């Protein structure tokens, strides 16, 4: 109820028109501020208690950002396009020690998003589903978050089948990329925590705040 895909699509269009690792961390920090402005544009999100808004974002930021630069890199050859306008080629990532995780992003996300031609509306809805993670610990009202999530995928499915009537399995195919997103998210965080530990690799304030406890 009251979860039009048009509003979700608008949120996407509104926020987005030498060590590769350092470039990635700087881009993540920059995009974190934008993530907040994007979340605010997602229907009913801002109406949630401030505390729950913090929980949802702290719990989904990495997956939310990974989903965005991955879809943004669909046209890119063998690599990704950072929000800073910089390109990180698969070989550059490999020569920095993050080749394994980088390839997972290209194989499981980038490539797959390209094969099915995932559009911005679908992308936005998937990110909205991630944002509304009912499993996020601390939620003062998990049931409510679960309600918003069901409205998002209810609208997404309607979008599909209607825009792509010929593809009855598109809806499920879209949701079936969430497991990979969760796995890739978790691995990327592990790397970030190691970079922070080693001391090397410059980490900005907002990104550093996200690596805080819990």
């Amino acid at each position: 109820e009251d979860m039009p895909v048009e509003r979700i699509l608008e949120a996407e269009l509104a926020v987005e028109p030498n060590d590769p690792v350092t470039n990635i961390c700087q881009a993540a920090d920059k995009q974190l501020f934008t993530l907040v402005e994007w979340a605010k544009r997602i229907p009913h999100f801002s109406e949630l208690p401030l505390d729950d808004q913090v929980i949802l974002l702290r719990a989904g930021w990495n997956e939310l950002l990974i989903a965005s630069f991955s879809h943004r890199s669909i046209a890119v050859k063998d690599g990704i396009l950072l929000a800073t306008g910089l390109h990180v080629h698969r070989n550059s990532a490999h020569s920095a020690g993050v080749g394994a995780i980088f390839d997972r992003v290209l194989t499981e996300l980038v490539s797959k998003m390209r094969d099915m031609q995932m559009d911005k509306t679908e992308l936005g809805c998937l990110r909205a589903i991630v944002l509304f993670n009912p499993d996020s610990k601390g939620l003062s009202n998990p049931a409510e978050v679960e309600a918003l999530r069901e409205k998002v995928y209810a609208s997404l499915e309607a979008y599909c089948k209607h825009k792509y009537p010929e593809q009855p399995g598109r809806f499920a195919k879209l949701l079936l990329r969430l497991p990979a997103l969760r796995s890739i998210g978790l691995k990327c965080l592990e790397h970030l925590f190691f970079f922070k530990l080693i001391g090397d690799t410059p980490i900005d304030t907002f990104l550093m705040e996200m690596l805080e406890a819990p």
Binding site: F33, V36, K40, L50, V54, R58, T205, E209, E212
Partner: peptide
Amino acid sequence: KHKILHRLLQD
């Protein structure tokens, strides 16, 4: 805690 985040969400 989460100083930056709270501030951005508040505005």
